């Protein structure tokens, strides 16, 4: 409704559209995360029965299907419908989003498909950051840059299985952000820096933690 | 060992693509139309994620006595996801209605009206009693309107893939929501024979042959049991 009334009345409109596309995938992904925590808790305490266990597996598979469907739709909308009309900023936003989506597909898939997805997410995150560095003034502390960094860091820590490198990556981004400070930072920048520092805090202690990603 | 499975959701993927292509490339003039398509696809995905929650509802309610908290989380997600299908499908419908006329192509107008038929069918799966019956009635209207437009405007309509996709969704409404599986199968049979009596030994489109297969498979499963 918010997005509808705005569109009914193209630059940050594309950004607005792209934020709604992100939300298609992350909304269903968040609900599945809730189901799995609940499942983990349930099964920690209880044996259940074979029928119930199957229903739960069925439900998870329904949610994963839907995440894969949304991800696939959105990647293609970004390539076919958004990218040729985007300015460098929206374009970078969209390339980051494609990395997020390749990452969410890799959380779900196995075998060679999983690996193909993690590789493409590396490719997009790397390409988004390079683009960001070339046009963003004061890129080290820009929130689009820090959110791309943050999300790449979660790819590095988990899917790529390099906790130490992920933490090094985050810490060097925090440092570079702080070295740029003068030249107050935006609310979004401070929010992202706190997530970076909070993730690092957990990782320093030998724990994956929440692996909090960017709120956009 | 379902290589049919990877083929099935690849068809679901092709379907989403086609919704957005049509809404977005059939117009005579948009970001709003992209959003309408994007939302149709979202709503289909929200519905898809709930299918086992729905078809196993009695098993799930049964488990709530001894497994309260888990089943409550499931119930809460279902309520929220269904609120979303209801609210966002009305969003898509409003967008379609405000822009319907800006599709000069007769096929594209029928496409949008079938789509409203689908979205009404979705609301009908969620809603209860009369509110449900009114959505079923509105879905009937939309399907019959789209079918009539397809009959009027489409070349060799009985074997046209949009025509057959419309038959199939109306058949689904008849089978499930209308509680008339026999009426549904006669309806499907009728359209199979009408399509076949179209065409030399001419080849139909791949999407026609896919839809005729689905229609045939469904009648036979009903005929055998």
Numbering used by the authors:
A (entry chain A): 46 to 54, 60 to 233, 236 to 268
B (entry chain B): 30 to 58, 62 to 231, 233 to 258
Cite, word for word, the article reporting this structure.
One protein family common to humans, C. parvum and in fact all eukaryotes is the group of tyrosine 3-monooxygenase/tryptophan 5-monooxygenase activation proteins (YWHA), also known as 14-3-3 proteins. All 14-3-3 proteins are dimers, with each subunit comprised of nine α-helices framing a peptide-binding cleft. The parasite Cryptosporidium parvum has three 14-3-3 proteins: Cp14ε, Cp14a and Cp14b, with only Cp14ε similar to human 14-3-3 proteins in sequence, peptide-binding properties and structure.
While Cp14ε conformably binds a number of known 14-3-3 ligands and Cp14a attracts none, the third C. parvum 14-3-3 protein in our study stands out by interacting with a peptide that is a phosphorylated copy of the last six amino acids in its own C-terminus: LLT(pS)AFF – a motif hitherto not known to be relevant in the context of 14-3-3 proteins. Protomer 1 follows the standard 14-3-3 architecture, albeit with the helix αB1 atypically disordered (and hence not visible in the crystallographic structure). The bound tail features a phosphorylated serine and the sequence LLT(pS)AFF. This serine, which was found to be phosphorylated in the crystal structure despite the fact that the protein was expressed in E. coli, interacts with the Arg79-Arg153-Arg154 triad just as the mode 1 peptide does in Cp14ε, with the backbone of Cp14b's tail tightly aligned with the peptide RAI(pS)LP and fitting in the binding groove in a very similar way. The resulting “super” helix, dubbed αAB2, is shifted from where αA and αB are typically found. In its new position, αAB2 blocks access to the binding groove and potentially contributes to inhibition of Cp14b's ability to bind another protein, as seen in Figs. 5D and 5E from two different angles. The novel dimer, held together by hydrophobic interaction, does not form a merged and undivided substrate cradle. The division and twisting of this cavity makes it impossible for the chaperone to hold a substrate in the standard way and potentially forms a third mode of inhibition for Cp14b.
